UniProtKB/Swiss-Prot annotation:
Originating species: Dictyostelium discoideum
Subunit structure, as described in the record: Oligomer.
Family in the record: Belongs to the protein kinase superfamily. Alpha-type protein kinase family. ALPK subfamily.
Record region (Catalytic): 1-255
Entry comment on modification after translation: The N-terminus is blocked.
Domain of life of the source: Eukaryota
Record protein name field: Myosin heavy chain kinase A
Lineage: Eukaryota, Amoebozoa, Evosea, Eumycetozoa, Dictyostelia
UniProt-annotated binding residues for ATP: G224, L225, G226, N227, L228, G229
Function, in words: Catalyzes its autophosphorylation, which is needed for enzymatic activity and phosphorylates myosin II heavy chain at a threonine in the C-terminal tail region. This phosphorylation is critical for regulating the assembly and disassembly of myosin II filament, affecting myosin localization during an array of cellular contractile events, including cytokinesis and capping of cell surface receptors as well as chemotactic cell locomotion.
Domain Alpha-type protein kinase stretches: 13-254
Length: 255
């Protein structure tokens, strides 16, 4: 939008309510060194230098992912234009040294986060002691960065900066890592209210602002490599103890 030295990116937002991706551009400036890492990715402080349209960067085609029918022809409205306005401090995440990553996985992961965000709203609507919220997430094609040896463009995901102490409350394979009730009751709520079609675990973040969740489904399909299917779900069942939040939401002690 307004520049000023940084790098260009193709910015992708998923909107669940119209079931389409919204394609934009942005400029960002990222720090050279990461400020945190996990098992898979490193996270980098970044500043936004504005969000604009994708008009200078034609799509193609010939195929494409996401496919053309999954892309909105109109991109005038989106969260990115407010949440990533010029001057915003945010987080960029890059995979560490990865051959398990594919273009399709970046998009699966961001869609997954958007799905959990809808679940957070549905939870909040039953009026629990502590409302919860999932951060937006976005796919960025770092188009100014040179493709590595394989010829693949550089991709990353971005999300807002969380301020405070970052805590993980459950894992994607049955760990209950804090004594807080809301995160565990939310996981249980997603399982029951979805009629056992899915569960949201890996509940982590700062307070009840959450990021990087994981979904399991009975058939194991979609939701990235962390979808552990029936094993994942059952592992949650084994360690769940219902709490006051579960009871308040009228969730069945039988899972
Ligand atoms: N939006 C955000 N704001 C501030 N810090 C964040 C953040 N998202 C992640 N972090 C921090 O960066 C670390 C690594 O990021 P992330 O957790 O996404 O890596 P990962 O994909 O390897 C999963 P894990 O760390 O659980 O193995 C987190 O453990 C947390 O400390
Ligand atoms: Zn419960």
């Amino acid at each position: 939008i307004s520049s000023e030295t940084g790098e260009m990116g193709i910015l992708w937002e998923f909107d669940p309510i119209i079931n389409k991706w919204i394609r934009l551009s942005m400029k960002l400036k990222v720090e050279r060194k990461p400020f945190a890492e996990g098992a898979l990715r490193e996270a980098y402080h970044t500043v936004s230098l504005g969000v604009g349209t994708d008009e200078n960067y034609p799509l193609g085609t010939t195929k494409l992912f996401p496919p053309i029918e999954m892309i909105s022809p109109i991109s005038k409205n989106n969260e990115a234009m407010t949440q990533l306005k010029n001057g915003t401090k945010f987080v960029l995440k890059l995979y560490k040294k990865e051959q398990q990553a594919s273009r399709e996985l970046y998009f699966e992961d961001v869609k997954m986060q958007m799905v959990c965000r809808d679940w957070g709203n549905k939870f909040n609507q039953k009026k629990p002691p502590k409302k919860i919220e999932f951060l937006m997430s976005w796919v960025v094609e770092l188009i100014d960065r040179s493709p590595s040896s394989n010829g693949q463009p550089i991709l990353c995901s971005i999300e807002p900066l969380l301020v405070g102490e970052f805590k993980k409350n459950n894992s994607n394979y049955g760990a209950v890592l804090t004594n807080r009730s809301t995160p565990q009751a939310f996981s249980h709520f997603t399982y029951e209210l979805s009629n056992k079609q899915m569960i949201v675990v890996d509940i982590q973040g700062v307070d009840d602002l959450y990021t990087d969740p994981q979904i399991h489904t009975p058939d194991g399909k979609g939701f990235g490599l962390g979808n552990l299917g029936k094993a994942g779900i059952n592992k949650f069942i084994t360690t769940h103890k219902c709490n006051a939040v579960c009871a308040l939401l009228d969730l069945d002690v039988k899972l």
